[PDB]
Swiss-Prot record, chain A:
It comes from Escherichia coli (strain K12). It comes from the Bacteria. DNA-dependent RNA polymerase (RNAP) catalyzes the transcription of DNA into RNA using the four ribonucleoside triphosphates as substrates. Resistance to the antibiotics salinamide A, salinamide B, rifampicin, streptolydigin, CBR703, myxopyronin, and lipiarmycin can result from mutations in this protein. Belongs to the RNA polymerase beta' chain family. Acetylated on several lysine residues in the presence of glucose. The gene is rpoC. The chain holds residues 1308 to 1357 of 1407 of the full protein. This is DNA-directed RNA polymerase subunit beta'.
UniProtKB/Swiss-Prot annotation, chain B:
Interacts transiently with the RNA polymerase catalytic core formed by RpoA, RpoB, RpoC and RpoZ (2 alpha, 1 beta, 1 beta' and 1 omega subunit) to form the RNA polymerase holoenzyme that can initiate transcription. Identified in a complex containing RpoD, the RNA polymerase subunits RpoA, RpoB and RpoZ, CRP and DNA. Interacts with Rsd; this prevents interaction with the RNA polymerase catalytic core and with promoter DNA, and as a consequence, promotes transcription from promoters that require alternative sigma factors. The lineage of its organism: Bacteria, Pseudomonadati, Pseudomonadota, Gammaproteobacteria, Enterobacterales. Changing residue 93 to D: Disrupts the interaction with Escherichia phage lambda antitermination protein Q. The chain holds residues 461 to 562 of 613 of the full protein. The gene is rpoD. It comes from Escherichia coli (strain K12). Contains 4 domains, connected by flexible linkers. In the active conformation, the domains are in an extended conformation, each making extensive interactions with the RNA polymerase catalytic core. In the autoinhibited state, sigma-70 factor domain-1 packs closely together with sigma-70 factor domains-2 and -4, contrary to the extended conformation that is seen when the protein is part of the RNA polymerase holoenzyme. It is found in: Cytoplasm. Belongs to the sigma-70 factor family. RpoD/SigA subfamily. Sigma factors are initiation factors that promote the attachment of RNA polymerase to specific initiation sites and are then released. This sigma factor is the primary sigma factor during exponential growth. Preferentially transcribes genes associated with fast growth, such as ribosomal operons, other protein-synthesis related genes, rRNA- and tRNA-encoding genes and prfB. The record marks 102 as: Interaction with anti-sigma factors. This is RNA polymerase sigma factor RpoD. Residues 1-74 are annotated as: Sigma-70 factor domain-3.
From Swiss-Prot, chain C:
Changing residue 680 to M: Resistant to antibiotics salinamide A and B. Belongs to the RNA polymerase beta chain family. Its EC number is 2.7.7.6. This is DNA-directed RNA polymerase subunit beta. Co-administration of salinamide and rifampicin or salinamide and myxopyronin suppresses the emergence of resistance to both antibiotics. Keywords: Acetylation, Antibiotic resistance, DNA-directed RNA polymerase, Nucleotidyltransferase, Transcription, Transferase. The gene is rpoB. One of its GO terms (cellular component) is cytosol.
Length: 50, 102, 1342, 552
């Protein structure tokens, strides 16, 4: 479903936005996940070209 | 604390509340210090205190930065350098040096 | 009755038939009545300050036998009156002085007092006071407390079918809601197990409370179940049979007794078999030993010999169990009567889920439910359970709760104890089970019989009660250790605790809000308002559509069409026209009692539940003569529905055709012709009309506007009738008639008029005299109009000539195209009064000066200021002008090399003081109408401030002197009259000095005692004047108390006059909005053959889609109205004679047949008639009753008298080309309002302003407004387009980048368009917040 | 940071941070004092509790701030929120170089521009004005430039006309849904404080004029100017991205103009004559000789590009009216005369623009669209269309239909008294007869209202589609529909009681007549549920778009 498929997103900064922040940050912080941007939502947060 | 004590009896004893200078004669010290002492004694207010609409507007969101410098000003600073630098090239090399020195 | 004096000035032509049997009561009733009951001396427990005292009192100490009781209370005179309290900013309040009696019982009594000290009226708090208009002043601002609508206290039985468990089966739950104290909830489950929960807490098996009530299982079974008697007589099981018990069950064995077999096995027992048993009276039958295998034993049963328990109560017996209790000698065994249809075996199964056994256990399990985790104690469990529903302190249903409680349980007493009793809980459980059993029904929350209405008085009582409990703990705490005769009921009772409870309510509460005063209708429609929100109510997020929707019980009580459109719909509504709060607090409405076949004019108020069973006729119905219903059947409503009802059935009939709507909806003409959506919006927008410069009058109307003007305090109503002695634009003095005058003091009524002053909405509220020198006025007549009121009616705007036709697209959507004639006539102009302030505070760097010496300002700047630094009164100002000079210390400027060179060349000394002076906001321009200077006590008042103080002193003396002069003359003028009776000397008496009159006596009579009376009151006034003058002078000279740190404050009052410009919002009463687009010259205005242009051109396309047809009718009749005016305007310019005018005017007021208006020739044929005609020449005022209003034929008929076409359409010619317009266009007169959305408020623009400290973001600090907020949706909008750079600049350089912004600005002036964006400070801050935790966040690579 | 009156205000973190230090410090002290186990343990627990409250408060006790009941907000709560990160959640950060106000019409505008208030443009472009003033030397230095615009010297206004000319501005409305919620326009200096917005765009914004406000944004960087002009420009989006149909379709007044323009009555001035071309056709009309609608043969030259990239020309005598002849002047080149030879309703008038776009391309369609608006407003004003109370014609047979429909209910009622029909069957039956009645009245007034204009050409009679005002509105597609029209003249509906059932005694009256007490009270529920439903479905719609944009 749309709300379920939107849950999985490679970029954690995007997920940290509309999902539960705590869980996203923790669950990402343990694995040492490296966000490469490459997406729209994340680039808007960091403030560079879409 | 001593001030609170007087304010307690005198609240109803006077029927209104003691005037800002009323507790002053009751207290030993120069008695104008009530204002100063009364101010520093206050506890600071939480910057997160919600005010109005219940909206995410919070007291801290309304506090402007006074230590910054507006660009409409900063622009005039960078220009004034070019200004005084231009007008100091219009004089003799010693007048420019002497004024740049002073 | 048969017509007043300001009615002779102007009369509104009233169509409509239905006679008004009852007239609109005081519309502010609730507000005034409520607070009137709150603060009052009531010698009993009726709600009021007395009751809240009598609850918590008397207060006795802890075991110490030291008691403090309450004697009586009083409200001291207000410290400041309403006006002074508003100017200064303090609260309008009275001191509460209450006599307390402290009794001390001798230690180790028999109770007797050592000494009892009565402390004379100890002061606790200052309680706010209500204005004569029903408003409060908290801090200098009029505020209204809206009446509240909540769930009535009592018992309520609900369903919760559907959603639960999705098996259907419904559920049945009961809820006991007290006025104060914990909630007691009962509810079923799918297994038919009765449950209980206190408040919202953990669910508990119902029976657990009964044990806590000290009920053993045996008495629980005995209470909720009947007894099935089993006899062992001879041997093997006989049984008692009540012949009705066999209904709903099938024979399980051979049923035989009395030597005759009534029913065999397998034959269901119907009413016929039951009849045989009933008529044959069969008490005892023989039953098998296996039938009790399922039957639950009622009481306990033990073996007489061994003394051992055979079976506990509520245990299922078996064939083996019967044997073990049989050999013990038991003849009788009691069992439960259980039927899965009629009487359910519920309670029995509830006990098997009950963890407790005895009272302490239940009390433990309850206490461990309420306060879990902590070890239970006997005294703790007992204390909790007794403190919840059984304590007079922590629990009350009050009167409404107890009444509805007892009433819903089919009890007798309508009034009773304010706590719960064991009988009550048990009875409530019985009713819930009875509903599950099929007898009885569930109520619904939306019904208006279960919805109770509070109001300021009731709410204030509750808050004062909270104050008394928090003071109670203290009083007991001190009386614990108290020394005998030293302390008194002063040292104990404080002020701040009580004062702060009540102050926290009126100051900030969801029900305490700024009165909406831009408009009389806005005020009066605010003061009648209901809310289901706020404390003790539901919330928008919480409650669904069930409570918001309109209910059949809303008829005559809540207005269906006046409610806000938005987040809360139907959560506000408004009070109806004739509605009144019921004696018990419900909503009841007026009705007419129909006895036999006659309609009686006795009025009867019926509440929501009272009205239910009666059959009520319709407001619109045809009866005649004796008032018998003409038709044999008429549309009526009886129980929740409407259908045709027979001639004599109806018990009652509606009083008026209006009573369904509210004051807002009742002011919309031809309302019956407008769709409900647009009508709502109309009555919603009608409250936003700003008053105008010239109060006009509505040309099309209803007839409530007259009543609304008077009932609202905007106008000045005659206290007593008489002739006006003096008329000024300032005051009005009326000489009283003797019949209306009281014997002593003689008198005259002096009305001091309000002049130009600031309203809550920053409009102008100014009164003008509507009466002329030496005119007779009768009691209850309008002396002076307020803002937006004309000659006693309510005018919220100005009617004008409007044409429906597309005009070159300038009217495109709702847009309005207005002729220049309107702005030139200055009719839609509005006067705004804004209050600007300048505060001189104290900083650690130094005190701030109001001095007029300001670094770097020219002579043109300092011109408009006096020597003291304050702008002169009356000086017209514009943007940039300095209202108050102010300068604050900032030391050691720390300049730079080139700034130092600059000062060196031009030789200027840069001041040690920085300029904080208050200057006029950008773009606003007006005239200064007043200045006030408040100063801290001990700082020297400057020059100007002293002038004002001296000025106010002299002005005060002049006013008081004026009072005394007119008053004394009025009294001596009566003495002159009494002396002339019994001893008349006319010319002789007025020669000698007036002061020496008091010596002359009279012959024995009451006239001698009357001179005595007038003497007494004269000297009183002489001294009352003196004391009043002193107080005023002291109030002037007293240094006003300011905030900490502020040394002095200067408030300047600017009066701006704004007219009309493109961007303003305009709408009619019919829900047709508009925003003026272009202001067109009179040259381009469409005109008719006569050459008269049209003021406004409306787009016709808005009329069909949004269905408001009244706006067209209002136009048509409007045109017709103007016609009758124009005609009169011609006959007045003809100066025909009184005869000719009278004829034509009479002709208009009849209009062809059957209306209720009546009319003249009782009126004086010359002076009174000619004045009326002069007021009608502008137009002929017409009254369209709400649902009783005029008809097409009448409008067309009035158009025949008008000389104007029936179609209401004429030919119009374009003022540009002069050629005709194809087709006729509708032209007429529509009433149109100017709302205050005005374009020069909404308009904002910002280039580079201040910035927020916490996050660097655009923020207005100067009232130069922060930029527009760019949201998530706008980002997506940029994302759909391919624009990356617009988006980057939007969220980086234009807002959040503390670097990029300045680097951009320098490039914008340099001529290089670029951005060197950097990283937004928001995200840069977010990094530190993440990094503030144990999370390391880095930016990798390169 | 300090405030006025010497008071201070600070973030809650301090109260938390302070705590973590103290207890921590106390513990350190408690180590060197050799405290018993029971104490240092309690101190350790207290330190643990304090750190937890600092990081994320609310997962244990929800500690409360000093003197204030409200729990102090912790670092997890600073990041967290609604929803998640406010740093680009709704809503959404403040932005410089912007403004807003009430908007108005300005029909004179080209579709690519918009009316901009003078003061707004002055305060908005302030840095550009400063930079431009000293580029040409009208101001000595930036300060003097500030003083000039702050003095509002007359000379600055011309400099603003320069910086405004080629420099698009972004316009935005409150409920932004699709990308057309923001569009670029060319600023036109306009006296007054109101924003003027091109009528053809009012459809894309869903912006009424009833007091809706719009916001302006200045595209500062060069890339933003070229982005706005080449992407966000008004003329570059003429078509909805949802479907290729034009969203610039003329709205109401304009389409009523063209409907009244190309229409024909039976007999009118100039009927039957012939004219050389549209030029002298307009000359006939404007001079008052010939009526706007009359059947007339005129020579026209149409074009078809049906050759290979090449416009063919052909001339003929077309049978048309005067209005269509005049209107033909607007149609560019290769469009056939067949497109304007019809009655030009709102539906056909849209496909005209559509075909024009799919044939001639972008540029011709823009100028075409403008012309349609201009001519629509003008001719609509000439038409003198209005709405009177006599424009709504009620059927003569209405009361009789009500009576017959009233007999059915009393027939079925007699059957329920005698038990011939069950209670439920009765309700459906009575409700059914009333519904049929509503259809009858609707289809009566519709026939009467539509065709009843009955007029004479050289003979006795004939009947055409009515020229009655309200019908023209509904027929053209401008405003109103058979449902709303039916509520005006014929009876309106059968309302429904709150529980969802429908009352078996419908509203027998309408708006042209009066509604009594009962009918209005019963109407109230439909209104309140409508407002509630729309206001709720509005919120529901927005949430859906959220999930959608999140998943894509
Ligand atoms: Mg709107």
């Amino acid at each position: 479903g749309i709300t379920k498929a939107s849950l999985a997103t490679e970029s954690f900064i995007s997920a940290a936005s509309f999902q539960e922040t705590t869980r996203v940050l923790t669950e990402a912080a343990v694995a040492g996940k490296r966000d490469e941007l490459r997406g729209l939502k994340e680039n808007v947060i960091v403030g560079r070209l879409i | 604390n001593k001030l609170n004590r007087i304010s307690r009896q005198m609240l109803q004893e006077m029927g209104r509340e003691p005037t800002p200078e009323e507790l002053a004669e009751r207290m030993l010290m120069p008695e104008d210090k009530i204002r100063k002492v009364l101010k520093i004694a206050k506890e600071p207010i939480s910057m997160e205190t919600p005010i109005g609409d219940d909206e995410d507007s919070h007291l801290g969101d309304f506090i402007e930065d006074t230590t910054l410098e507006l660009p409409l000003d900063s622009a005039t600073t960078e220009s004034l350098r070019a200004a005084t630098h231009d007008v100091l090239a219009g004089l003799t090399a010693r007048e420019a040096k002497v004024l740049r020195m002073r | 009755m048969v017509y007043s004096y300001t009615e002779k000035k102007r009369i509104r032509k009233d169509f409509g038939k239905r006679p008004q049997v009852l007239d609109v009561p005081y519309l502010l009733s609730i507000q005034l009545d409520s607070f009137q009951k709150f603060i009052e001396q009531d010698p009993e427990g009726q709600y009021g300050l007395e009751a809240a005292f009598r609850s918590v009192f008397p207060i006795q100490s802890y075991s110490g036998n030291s008691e403090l009781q309450y004697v009586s209370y009083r409200l001291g005179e207000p410290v400041f009156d309403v006006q002074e309290c508003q100017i200064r900013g303090v609260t309008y309040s009275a001191p509460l002085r209450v006599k307390l009696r402290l009794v001390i019982y001798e230690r180790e009594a028999p109770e007797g007092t050592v000494k009892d000290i009565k402390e004379q009226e100890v002061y606790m708090g200052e309680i706010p006071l209500m204005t004569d208009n029903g408003t409060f002043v908290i801090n200098g601002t009029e505020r209204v407390i809206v009446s509240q609508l909540h769930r009535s206290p009592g018992v309520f039985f609900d369903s919760d079918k559907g959603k639960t468990h999705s098996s259907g089966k419904v559920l049945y739950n009961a809820r006991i809601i007290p006025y104060r104290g914990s909630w007691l909830d009962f509810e079923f489950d799918p297994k038919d197990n009765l449950f209980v929960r206190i408040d919202r807490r953990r669910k508990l098996p119902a029976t657990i409370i009964l044990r806590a009530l000290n009920y053993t299982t045996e008495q629980i079974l005995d209470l909720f179940f009947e007894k099935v008697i089993f006899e062992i007589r001879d041997n093997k099981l006989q049984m008692e049979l009540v012949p009705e018990r066999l209904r709903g069950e099938t024979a399980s064995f051979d049923i035989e007794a009395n030597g005759k077999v009534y029913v065999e096995k397998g034959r269901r027992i119907t009413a016929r078999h039951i009849r045989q048993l009933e008529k044959d009276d069969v008490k005892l039958i023989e039953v098998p030993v296996e039938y009790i295998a399922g039957k639950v034993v009622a009481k306990d049963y033990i073996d007489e010999s061994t003394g051992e328990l055979i079976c506990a109560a509520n245990m299922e017996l078996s064939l083996d169990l019967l044997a073990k209790l049989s050999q013990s000698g038991h003849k009788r065994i009691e069992t439960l009567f259980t039927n899965d249809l009629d009487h359910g075996p519920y309670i029995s199964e509830t006990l098997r889920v009950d963890p407790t056994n005895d009272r302490l256990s239940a009390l433990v399990e309850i206490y461990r439910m309420m306060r879990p985790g902590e070890p239970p104690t006997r005294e703790a469990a007992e204390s909790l359970f007794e403190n919840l529903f059984f304590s007079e302190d922590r629990y009350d249903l009050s009167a409404v709760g107890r009444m509805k409680f007892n009433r819903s349980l089919l009890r007798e007493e309508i009034e009773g104890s304010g706590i719960l009793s064991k009988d009550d809980i048990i009875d409530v459980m019985k009713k819930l089970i009875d509903i599950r059993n099929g007898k009885g029904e569930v109520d619904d929350i939306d019904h208006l019989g279960n919805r109770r209405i509070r109001s300021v008085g009731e709410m204030a009582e509750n808050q004062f009660r909270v104050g008394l409990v928090r003071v109670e703990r203290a009083v007991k705490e001190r009386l614990s250790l108290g020394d005998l005769d030293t302390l008194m009921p002063q040292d104990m009772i404080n002020a701040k605790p009580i004062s702060a409870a009540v102050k926290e309510f009126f100051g900030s509460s969801q029900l305490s809000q700024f009165m909406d005063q831009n408009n009389p209708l806005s005020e009066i429609t605010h003061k009648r308002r209901i809310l289901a929100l706020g404390p003790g109510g539901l919330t928008r997020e919480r409650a669904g559509f069930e409570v918001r929707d309109v209910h059949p019980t809303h008829y005559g009580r809540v207005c269906p069409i006046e409610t806000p459109e938005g987040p809360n719909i139907g959560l506000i509504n408004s009070l109806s026209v004739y509605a009144q709060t019921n004696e018990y607090g419900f909503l009841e409405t007026p009705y007419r009692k129909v006895t036999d076949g006659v309609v009686t004019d006795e009025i009867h108020y019926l509440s929501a539940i009272e009205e239910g069973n009666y059959v009520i006729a319709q407001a619109n119905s045809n009866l005649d003569e004796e008032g018998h219903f003409v038709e044999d059947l008429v549309t009526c409503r009886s129980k929740g529905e409407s259908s045709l009802f027979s001639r004599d059935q109806v018990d009652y009939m509606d009083v008026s055709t209006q009573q369904v709507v509210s004051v807002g909806a009742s002011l919309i003409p031809f309302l019956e012709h407008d769709d409900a959506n647009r009508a709502l919006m109309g009555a919603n927008m009608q409250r936003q009309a700003v008053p105008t410069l010239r109060a006009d009058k509505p040309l099309v109307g209803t007839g409530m506007e007259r009543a609304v003007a008077v009932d609202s305090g905007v106008t000045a109503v005659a206290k007593r009738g008489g002739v006006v002695q003096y008329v000024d634009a300032s005051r009005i003095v009326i000489k009283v008639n003797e019949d209306e005058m009281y014997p002593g003091e003689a008198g005259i009524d002096i009305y001091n008029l309000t002049k130009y002053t600031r309203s809550n909405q920053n409009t102008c509220i100014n009164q003008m005299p509507c009466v002329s020198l030496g005119e007779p006025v009768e009691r209850g007549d309008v002396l002076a109009d307020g803002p937006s009121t004309d000659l006693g009616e309510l005018a919220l705007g100005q009617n004008m000539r409007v044409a429906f036709m597309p005009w070159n697209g300038y009217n495109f959507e709702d847009s309005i195209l207005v002729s220049e004639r309107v702005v030139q006539e200055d009719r839609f102009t509005t006067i705004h009064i804004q209050e600007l302030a300048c505060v001189s505070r104290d900083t650690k760097l130094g005190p701030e000066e109001i001095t007029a010496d300001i670094p770097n300002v020219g002579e043109a700047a300092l011109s408009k200021l006096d020597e003291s630094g304050i702008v002169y009164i009356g000086a017209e100002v514009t943007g940039g002008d300095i209202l108050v000079g102010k300068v604050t210390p900032k030391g050691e400027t720390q300049l730079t090399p080139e700034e130092k060179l600059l000062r060196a060349i031009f030789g200027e000394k840069a001041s040690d003081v920085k300029d904080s002076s208050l200057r006029v906001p950008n773009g606003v321009s007006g005239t200064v109408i007043d200045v006030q200077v408040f100063t801290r006590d001990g700082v020297e008042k400057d020059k100007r401030a002293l002038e004002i103080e001296e000025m106010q002193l002299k002005q005060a003396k002049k006013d008081l002197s004026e009072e005394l002069q007119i008053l004394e003359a009025g009294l001596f003028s009566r003495i002159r009259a009494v002396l002339v009776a019994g001893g008349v000397e006319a010319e002789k008496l007025d020669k000698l000095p007036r002061d020496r009159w008091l010596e002359l006596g009279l012959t024995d009579e009451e006239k001698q005692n009357q001179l005595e009376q007038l003497a007494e009151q004269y000297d009183e006034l002489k001294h009352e004047f003196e004391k009043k003058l002193e107080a005023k002078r002291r109030k002037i000279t007293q240094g006003d108390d300011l905030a900490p740190g502020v040394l002095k404050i200067v408030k300047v009052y600017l009066a701006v006059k704004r007219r009309i410009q493109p961007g303003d919002k305009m709408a009619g009463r019919h829900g047709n909005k508009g925003v003026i687009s272009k202001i067109n010259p009179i040259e381009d205005m469409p005109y008719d053959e006569n050459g008269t242009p049209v003021d406004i051109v409306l787009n016709p396309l808005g009329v069909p889609s949004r269905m408001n047809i009244g706006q067209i009718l209002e136009t048509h009749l409007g045109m017709a109205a103007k016609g009758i005016g124009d005609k009169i305007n011609a006959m007045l310019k003809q100066q025909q004679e009184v005869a000719k005018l009278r004829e034509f005017i009479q002709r208009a007021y009849d209009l062809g047949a059957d209306v209720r208006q009546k009319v003249d020739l009782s009126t004086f044929s010359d002076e009174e008639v000619m004045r009326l005609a002069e007021n009608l020449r502008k137009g002929m005022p017409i009254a369209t009753p709400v649902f009783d209003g005029a008809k097409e034929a009448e409008i067309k008929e009035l158009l025949k008298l008008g000389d104007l076409p029936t179609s209401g359409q004429i030919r119009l010619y374009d003022g540009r080309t002069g050629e005709q317009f194809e087709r006729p266009v509708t032209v007429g007169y529509m009433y149109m309002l100017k709302l205050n959305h005005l374009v020069d408020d909404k308009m904002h623009a910002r280039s580079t302003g201040s910035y927020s400290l916490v996050t660097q973001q655009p923020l207005g600090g100067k009232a130069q407004f922060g930029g527009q907020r760019f949201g998530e949706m706008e980002v997506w909008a940029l994302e759909a387009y391919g624009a990356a750079y617009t988006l980057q600049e939007m969220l980086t350089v234009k807002s959040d980048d503390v670097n990029g912004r300045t680097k951009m600005y320098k490039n914008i002036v340099d001529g290089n368009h670029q951005m060197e964006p950097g990283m937004p400070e928001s995200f840069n801050v977010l990094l530190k917040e993440i990094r503030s935790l144990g999370i390391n966040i880095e930016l990798e690579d390169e | 940071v300090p405030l006025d009156g010497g008071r201070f205000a600070t973030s809650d973190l301090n109260d938390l941070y302070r705590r973590v230090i103290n207890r921590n410090n106390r513990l350190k002290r408690l180590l060197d004092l050799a405290a018993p186990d029971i104490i240092v343990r309690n101190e350790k627990r207290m330190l643990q509790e304090a750190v937890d409250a600092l990081l994320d408060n609310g997962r244990r006790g929800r500690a409360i701030t000093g003197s204030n009941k409200r729990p102090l907000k912790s670092l997890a709560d600073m990041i967290k929120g609604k929803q998640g990160r406010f740093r680009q959640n709704l809503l959404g950060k403040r932005v410089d170089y912007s403004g807003r106000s009430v908007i108005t019409v300005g029909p004179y505008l080209r579709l690519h521009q918009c009316g901009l208030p003078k003061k707004m443009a002055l305060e908005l472009f302030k840095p550009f004005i400063y930079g431009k003033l000293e580029l040409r030397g009208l101001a000595t230095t930036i300060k003097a430039a500030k003083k000039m615009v702050e003095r509002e010297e007359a000379v600055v206004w011309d400099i603003l006309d320069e910086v405004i000319r080629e420099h698009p501005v972004l316009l935005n409305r409150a409920p932004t849904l699709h990308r057309l919620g923001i569009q670029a326009f060319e600023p036109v200096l306009i006296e007054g404080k109101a924003i003027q917005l091109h009528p053809l765009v009012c459809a894309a914004y869903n912006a009424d004029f009833d007091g809706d406000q719009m916001a302006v944004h200045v595209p500062l960087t060069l890339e933003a100017q070229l982005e706005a002009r080449a992407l966000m420009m008004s003329t570059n989006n003429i078509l909805s991205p949802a479907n290729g149909e034009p969203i610039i379709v003329p709205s109401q007044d304009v389409v009523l103009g063209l409907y009244y323009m190309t229409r024909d009555c039976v007999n009118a001035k100039g009927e039957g004559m012939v004219l050389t071309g549209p030029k002298e056709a307009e000359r006939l009309y404007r001079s008052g000789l010939a009526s706007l609608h009359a059947r007339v043969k005129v020579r026209i030259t149409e074009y078809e590009k049906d050759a290979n990239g090449e416009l063919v020309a052909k001339t003929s005598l077309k049978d048309t009216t005067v209005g269509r002849a005049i209107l033909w002047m607007i149609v560019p080149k290769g469009l056939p005369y067949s497109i304007v030879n019809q009655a030009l309703g709102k539906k056909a008038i849209s496909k005209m623009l559509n075909t024009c776009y799919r044939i001639l391309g972008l540029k011709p369609t823009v100028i075409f669209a403008d012309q349609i608006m201009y001519t629509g407003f003008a001719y609509a004003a000439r038409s003198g269309a209005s709405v009177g109370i006599d424009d709504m014609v009620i059927p003569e047979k209405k009361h009789e239909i009500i009576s017959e429909a009233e007999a059915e209910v009393a027939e079925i009622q007699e059957q329920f008294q005698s038990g011939l029909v069950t209670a439920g069957e009765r309700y459906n039956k009575v409700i059914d007869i009333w519904a049929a009645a509503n259809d009858r009245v609707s289809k009566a007034m519709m026939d009467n209202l539509q065709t009843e204009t009955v007029i004479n050409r050289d003979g006795q009679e004939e009947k055409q589609v009515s020229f009655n005002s309200i019908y023209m509105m509904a027929d053209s597609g401008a405003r109103g529909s058979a449902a709303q029209i039916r509520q005006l003249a014929g009876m309106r509906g059968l309302m429904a009681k709150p529980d969802g059932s429908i009352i078996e005694t419908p509203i027998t009256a309408n708006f042209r007549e009066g509604l009594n007490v009962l009918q209005y009270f019963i109407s109230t529920h439909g209104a309140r549920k409508g407002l509630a439903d729309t206001a709720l479905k509005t919120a529901n719609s927005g949430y859906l778009t959220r999930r959608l944009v999140d998943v894509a």
